[PDB]
Design a protein around this ligand. Structure first.
Ligand SMILES: Nc1ncnc2c1ncn2[C@@H]1O[C@H](COP(=O)(O)OP(=O)(O)O)[C@@H](O)[C@H]1O
Lengths: 52, 424
């Protein structure tokens, strides 16, 4: 056989770069507080999401 | 006020003067006479407008002055700008950057129209603020409403390298091709002393921030040259690239046009290629037209010629109209008869109407009698010349004695040749 290894013989931090975490993008479709459509915009002055 | 297009030779022909039954009228919208020829022209016009069959070819033949070019202009004005009508002379294919064959192919493809319809989602608004840290946020405004957007790196790189700035009326599409639309009218007084040559100040949009662009536009199939080079629309403004590869012309562009047609994003509208003075073509060009007419999506050819039995260019052979028999076999021939004492007078009357000249009926009689002896096309020129000679005489109507004032100044081919007894 001809198999391959990569050994991080240095500080394990250099392997620690890669693993753990892997979160989702938590937000989901936001609903506006007026017409209750799913939002298309976020107002710069309130940060409220809105549609129409 | 005088504009670019003013009174030319065929200016009075505002259409082909036919009934709904394709029956020609004695005198109608600009055209006079040639009942047989105009009925035939109407029939081929109808098959142009149906568009169902490909590579049809018609030869308008006859003596100089019958109305072959006049009939072609009648067909071209009867047909709307929607259908491509390409007019060339047979002399225009004798190129230096192309061969005869490639230029003739390009003309053929110029006679096929393609109506693009394109349908794109757009974000448009005045930029209120941009922030960049790489990541940032963008505040867009329309007179109705305002929003934040979050920017990724490609969007950021095309904000900065575009030097978009607060106040710019910006426009962004899905699969962004961001283009700067305008400049805010508030960040103004900049032209207290100067503006950039590209800068504009018209105001920010209204309604929703997200909209849909419909765009419809007729290109000709010759848009093949839009894909013959790296940057290629330029070659539609300078004729540029010469023999673009057939391996991309006949399969890629036709295939993608068929795909557009099937999806519904395009539609071919086949038009007309009018080669005037077609006898100027070489046997190479004629024998090319042989196969070109057989092709799946040729336009309809119209040809005009005034030649008898004459030599074909590029040969020592003689044939009808000066074009080969194997190509006449592929044509329908429309002959044109000359005008009599009745129709010559009437087209002179039409030309006086077009040039806004008023003539005595005596002057009409004289001008017709002069035209029937030397040439039809000459009596048309005496109209304007007599108008001018009468304008300096403090007159208001062209008179019989004025036609003779012109008739001795500007002498016909006949009298001009007859006075070559001097042999310098
Ligand atoms: N049927 C017609 N109706 C109105 N004007 C015509 C007609 N035929 C010819 N004329 C006039 O006479 C001129 C000569 O006709 P034209 O078609 O140019 O000659 P050719 O038949 O050699 O092309 C035209 O330029 C036009 O002004």
């Amino acid at each position: 056989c001809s198999r391959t290894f990569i050994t991080f013989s240095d500080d394990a931090t250099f392997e620690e770069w890669f693993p753990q975490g892997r979160p989702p993008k938590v937000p989901v479709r936001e609903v506006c507080p007026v017409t209750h459509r799913p939002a298309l915009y976020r107002d710069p002055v309130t940060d409220i999401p809105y549609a129409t | 006020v005088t504009r670019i297009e003013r009174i030319g030779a065929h200016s009075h022909i505002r259409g082909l003067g036919l009934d709904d039954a394709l029956e020609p009228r004695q005198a109608s919208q600009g055209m006079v006479g040639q009942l047989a020829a105009r009925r035939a022209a109407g029939v081929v016009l109808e098959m142009i407008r149906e568009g169902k069959i490909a590579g049809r070819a018609v030869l308008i033949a006859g003596q100089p002055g019958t109305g072959k070019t006049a009939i072609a202009m009648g067909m071209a004005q009867a047909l709307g700008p929607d259908t491509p009508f390409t007019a060339i002379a047979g002399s225009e294919i004798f190129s230096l950057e192309m061969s005869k064959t490639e230029a003739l192919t390009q003309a053929f493809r110029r006679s096929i129209g393609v109506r693009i319809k394109e349908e794109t989602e757009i974000i448009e608004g005045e930029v209120v603020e941009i922030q960049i840290d790489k990541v940032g946020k963008l505040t867009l405004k329309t007179t109705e409403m305002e929003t934040i957007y979050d920017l990724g790196t490609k969007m950021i790189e095309s904000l900065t390298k575009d030097k978009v700035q607060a106040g710019d009326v910006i426009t962004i599409d899905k699969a962004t091709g961001k283009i700067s639309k305008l400049g805010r009218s508030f960040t103004r007084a900049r032209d207290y002393d100067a503006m950039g040559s590209q800068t504009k100040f018209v105001q920010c949009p209204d309604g929703e921030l997200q909209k849909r662009k419909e765009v419809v536009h007729t290109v000709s199939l010759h848009e093949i040259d839009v894909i013959n080079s790296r940057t290629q629309g330029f070659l539609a403004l300078f004729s540029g690239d010469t023999g673009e590869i057939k391996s991309e012309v006949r399969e890629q562009i036709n295939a993608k046009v068929a795909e557009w047609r099937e999806e519904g994003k395009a539609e071919i509208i086949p038009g007309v290629l009018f080669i005037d003075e077609v006898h100027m073509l070489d046997i190479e060009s004629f024998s090319f037209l042989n196969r070109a007419l057989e092709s799946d999506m040729a336009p309809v050819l119209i040809m005009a010629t005034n030649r008898g039995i004459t030599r074909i260019r590029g040969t020592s052979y003689q044939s009808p109209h000066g074009i080969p028999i194997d190509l006449l076999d592929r044509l329908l021939i429309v002959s044109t008869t000359p005008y009599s004492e009745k129709d010559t007078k009437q087209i002179l009357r039409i030309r006086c109407e077009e040039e806004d000249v008023e003539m005595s009926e005596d002057a009409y009689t004289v001008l017709t009698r002069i035209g029937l002896e030397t040439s039809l096309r000459y009596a048309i020129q005496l109209i304007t010349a007599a108008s001018l000679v009468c304008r300096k005489r403090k007159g208001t109507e062209v008179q019989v004695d004025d036609i003779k004032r012109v008739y001795s100044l500007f002498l016909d081919e006949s009298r001009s040749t007859q006075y070559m007894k001097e042999y310098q």
